[PDB]
Amino acid sequence: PTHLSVDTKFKTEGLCVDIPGIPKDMTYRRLISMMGFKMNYQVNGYPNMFITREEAIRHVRAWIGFDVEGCHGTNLPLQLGFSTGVNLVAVPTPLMYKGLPWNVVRIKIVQMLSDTLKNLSDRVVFVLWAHGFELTSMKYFVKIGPERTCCLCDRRATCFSTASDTYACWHHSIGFDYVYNPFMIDVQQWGFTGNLQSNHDLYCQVHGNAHVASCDAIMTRCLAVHECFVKRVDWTIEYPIIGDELKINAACRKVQHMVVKAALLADKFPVLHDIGNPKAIKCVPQADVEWKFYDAQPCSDKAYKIEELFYSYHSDKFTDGVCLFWNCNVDRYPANSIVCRFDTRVLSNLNLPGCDGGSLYVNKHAFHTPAFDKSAFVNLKQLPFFYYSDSPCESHGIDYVPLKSATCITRCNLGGAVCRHHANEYRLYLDAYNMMISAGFSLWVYKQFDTYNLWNTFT
Ligand SMILES: CC1CCN(C(=O)c2cc3ccccc3o2)CC1
Ligand SMILES: [Zn+2]
Numbered sequence: 229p230t231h232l233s234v235d236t237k238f239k240t241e242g243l244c245v246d247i248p249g250i251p252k253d254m255t256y257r258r259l260i261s262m263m264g265f266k267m268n269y270q271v272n273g274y275p276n277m278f279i280t281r282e283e284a285i286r287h288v289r290a291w292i293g294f295d296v297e298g299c300h301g302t303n304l305p306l307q308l309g310f311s312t313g314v315n316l317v318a319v320p321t322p323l324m325y326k327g328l329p330w331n332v333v334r335i336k337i338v339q340m341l342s343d344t345l346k347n348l349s350d351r352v353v354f355v356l357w358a359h360g361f362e363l364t365s366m367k368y369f370v371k372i373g374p375e376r377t378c379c380l381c382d383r384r385a386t387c388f389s390t391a392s393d394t395y396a397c398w399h400h401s402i403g404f405d406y407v408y409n410p411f412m413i414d415v416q417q418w419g420f421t422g423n424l425q426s427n428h429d430l431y432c433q434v435h436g437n438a439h440v441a442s443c444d445a446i447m448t449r450c451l452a453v454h455e456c457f458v459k460r461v462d463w464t465i466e467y468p469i470i471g472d473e474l475k476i477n478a479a480c481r482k483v484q485h486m487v488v489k490a491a492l493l494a495d496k497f498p499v500l501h502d503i504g505n506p507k508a509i510k511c512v513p514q515a516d517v518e519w520k521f522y523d524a525q526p527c528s529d530k531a532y533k534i535e536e537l538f539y540s541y542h543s544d545k546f547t548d549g550v551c552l553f554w555n556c557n558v559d560r561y562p563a564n565s566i567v568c569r570f571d572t573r574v575l576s577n578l579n580l581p582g583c584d585g586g587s588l589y590v591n592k593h594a595f596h597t598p599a600f601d602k603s604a605f606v607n608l609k610q611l612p613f614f615y616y617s618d619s620p621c622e623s624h625g626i627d628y629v630p631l632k633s634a635t636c637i638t639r640c641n642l643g644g645a646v647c648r649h650h651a652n653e654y655r656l657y658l659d660a661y662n663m664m665i666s667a668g669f670s671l672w673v674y675k676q677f678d679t680y681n682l683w684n685t686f687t
């Protein structure tokens with residue numbers, strides 16, 4: 229039960245308008261053969277062009293929605309649409325390109341996939357809502373065979389060049405003309421009633437239908453993301469490290485401790501209501517405060533309604549003390565809150581386009597996050613940068629330029645000049661802070677929060 233068997237059945241009903249007379253009885257083995265490919269009884273790591281839903285979920289970073297719409301099959305020009313928003317027109321002699329022959333179209337395809345995927349995945353997974361032309365056009369830009377490595381590096385080959393007879397990964401494919409050993413999944417095989425637009429529109433209002441192939445390619449990948457990450461959630465699937473994952477997670481832990489410690493010192497709340505992670509630990513273990521935990525898993529569809537989290541009869545009084553919502557996305561935060569909210573609009577290799585304005589944030593695990601909404605924070609203000617420390621001014625053990633900063637809240641800065649230890653610690657914390665902010669996180673705090681109240685914690 230590793231890969232999808234080629235002898236598995238393929239429902240051909242969705243294919244019979246572009247392919248009239250298609251047999252109802254059909255396997256992946258026969259379909260691949262009909263697509264013009266020959267698998268030659270090869271036991272070399274590529275057992276099937278098509279993959280299982282479980283394999284697609286593990287390779288979500290590789291997903292590229294793909295759709296082909298006939299402008300006028302062998303005689304008529306095709307419109308190739310991709311979930312990148314690209315539309316290429318191929319002649320057989322929302323970015324719209326004029327009609328060009330396949331020999332130049334395939335070059336643009338390799339360029340586009342390589343630029344989109346090089347920092348995301350070792351492969352491409354073509355996400356389809358298959359009607360016929362997308363499958364029968366694959367032979368014009370795809371070559372298959374045994375699993376290979378890049379000519380210039382150790383990564384698996386994802387491209388082929390007919391000019392040099394060589395193979396390359398997404399990083400070394402400049403001037404390559406064929407997509408090598410791609411993967412694909414037909415969403416129509418999952419059991420749906422009705423056309424793509426009707427099933428997509430049940431869950432998403434952000435993607436519209438202009439009737440161009442890229443629009444359908446976008447709706448397909450969106451529907452696939454809703455099915456695999458919004459309605460069905462799996463926090464047991466690990467994902468490889470492709471960027472600053474560890475540094476961002478470490479920075480997040482440092483910022484949480486810093487912000488929560490300072491709020492408890494500035495406003496001395498008697499109780500803290502920690503809403504979120506059922507496996508959460510006190511971020512400030514030495515604080516005097518009464519720490520009360522409330523379990524809520526990450527919401528992947530719509531943000532939690534504060535009325536359902538707090539009401540229906542716990543301290544009961546959430547109005548007492550402070551509330552901490554560290555990645556616990558709610559519709560409107562109460563005024564007495566400390567909040568970390570991920571901004572779904574952020575551009576990064578970790579954040580993939582999602583469903584209904586939301587985004588698929590992939591960092592060790594995949595978390596579909598509801599659309600960032602500025603109105604959730606009307607009772608709060610943006611938390612400004614500050615570094616706070618009550619640790620002794622003692623260096624122990626990198627060089628030095630004297631630090632001067634109004635936001636270095638330490639005994640040394642209070643007393644006039646920042647010590648070397650607190651200057652090192654301040655710069656490291658500011659680096660972690662910028663990492664976390666640029667990863668897409670946003671910090672919000674109750675309006676009375678004032679760092680001026682921290683200077684008196686040194687007396
Ligand atoms: C897009 C965000 C990125 C950071 N996330 C978490 O670190 C996380 C883990 C967890 C477990 C339970 C409740 C909330 C939780 O947030 C997921 C959300
Ligand atoms: Zn390479």
Ligand SMILES: [Zn+2]
Nearest residue numbers: 432435450584
């Ligand atoms: Zn959508």
Ligand SMILES: [Zn+2]
Nearest residue numbers: 621640647650
């Ligand atoms: Zn100091």
